[PDB]
Structure 1
Amino acid sequence: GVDISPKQDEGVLKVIKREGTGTETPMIGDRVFVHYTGWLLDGTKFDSSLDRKDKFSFDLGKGEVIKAWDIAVATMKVGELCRITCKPEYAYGSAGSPPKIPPNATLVFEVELFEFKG
């Protein structure tokens, strides 16, 4: 339900709405069938995966996503619903997202995780 990272203290953290059915969580390098909505800190909707024909999907912590997703998606159960609050050290700070994000802006993603190790 909160914010901070339990090692660096800045990184991420996540607001719970609907907790899971299958109590298990994903392991490092496992395949997860996610779907996300996402906003910048000014309340601007830059991205939502369902709109582009289908759901989202990655392999936990493989370069593929952001480090804020490897921390908060490692803590996500089968069927769960929450909202991620992320900081640029774990996200777009040392890079910037291609269409409009600069190297120092706060970030937001509402994630629904369907299933992973199953």
Structure 2
Amino acid sequence: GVDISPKQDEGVLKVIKREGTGTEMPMIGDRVFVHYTGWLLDGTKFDSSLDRKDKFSFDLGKGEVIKAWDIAIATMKVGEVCHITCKPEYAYGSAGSPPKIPPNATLVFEVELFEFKGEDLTEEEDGGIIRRIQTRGEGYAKPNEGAIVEVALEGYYKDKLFDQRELRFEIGEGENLDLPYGLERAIQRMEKGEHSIVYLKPSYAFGSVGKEKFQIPPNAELKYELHLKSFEKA
């Protein structure tokens, strides 16, 4: 296997069993759909999603799964099947996960990637605001209502640029700066230094009114490229 651990300490070793398609791989924040089987190093099977009705899904790069999985799934293409050998430091460590996983266990997973998609940032989960993180930010802190943010933004309608600015403004006051509501909600989910693409459905953008000065008609879907440069909370 190929050592895919950031520290190159052979913590996560990947063997590709079947190559996937295209070039794209899941990004941090993306929802990911896989089937897997897990064995201890001695070949004892402890679990498989194949034994259940649904694919296993999780959000990548958020510490929702063991570190070996956040590392490994990021390297996969759609359709890929790989085997990953995971040292305990990248899995369950000294604690283990009784009764299935003993302390200090090296784990082997077979993983097949079926699908991934951008993160739906909406409260209703109606697909109205979809994010694709390009580059992860620094701290985990995010701007809240009333935070003063510095943001570089590019707005596109049908891939044509209509707005490109570097702004400093208070979250909650974006409307007066011709920023759509959904963009301000998206910024509240971003970390300092993060570069993301955010897709807005009309309901979260300029709705039935549009934005005439930006040549945006009623009921327009928009795409923004956003860089959160800095912010001061509160």
Q: TM-score w.r.t. structure 1 length?
A: 0.89
Q: Return the offset for 1:54.
A: 1.7
Q: Return the offset for 1:20.
A: 1.3
Higher radius of gyration, 1 or 2: 2
Question: Which stretch of structure 1 is more off in the superposition, 6-15 or 77-86?
Answer: 6-15
- Cα contact 1:81–1:113 (8 A) shared by 2: yes
SS of the aligned residue for 1:92 comes to coil
- Stretches of 4+ moved more than 4 A in 1? none
Partner of 2:108: 108
* Matched residues, number: 116
- Cα contact 1:93–1:102 (8 A) shared by 2: no
Higher strand proportion (structure 1 or 2): 2
The 1:61/1:96 distance shift into structure 2, 3 A limit, reads: same
- Cα contact 1:3–1:85 (8 A) shared by 2: no
The 1:64/1:3 distance shift into structure 2, 3 A limit, reads: same
Unaligned runs of 5+ residues in structure 2 are 117-234
- Cα contact 2:4–2:71 (8 A) shared by 1: no
- Cα contact 2:95–2:104 (8 A) shared by 1: no
The 1:106/1:21 distance shift into structure 2, 3 A limit, reads: same
Question: Which stretch of structure 1 is more off in the superposition, 19-28 or 93-102?
Answer: 93-102
Higher relative contact order (CA 8 A, sep 6+): 1
- Cα contact 1:34–1:112 (8 A) shared by 2: yes
Question: Which stretch of structure 1 is more off in the superposition, 93-102 or 38-47?
Answer: 93-102
Residues of 2 paired with 1:38 and 1:50: CA distance? Answer: 11
Q: TM-score w.r.t. structure 2 length?
A: 0.47
Spell out, residue by residue over 1:32-89, the C-alpha distance to the aligned partner (whole angstroms, 9 max, x if none): 0111011001110100012122211100022321100011111111111111110011
Residues of 2 paired with 1:53 and 1:69: CA distance? Answer: 21
What is the RMSD of the two structures over their aligned residues, measured on CA atoms?
1.6
Correspondence 1:47-58 to 2 at 5 A: 47-58=47-58
Partner of 1:62: 62
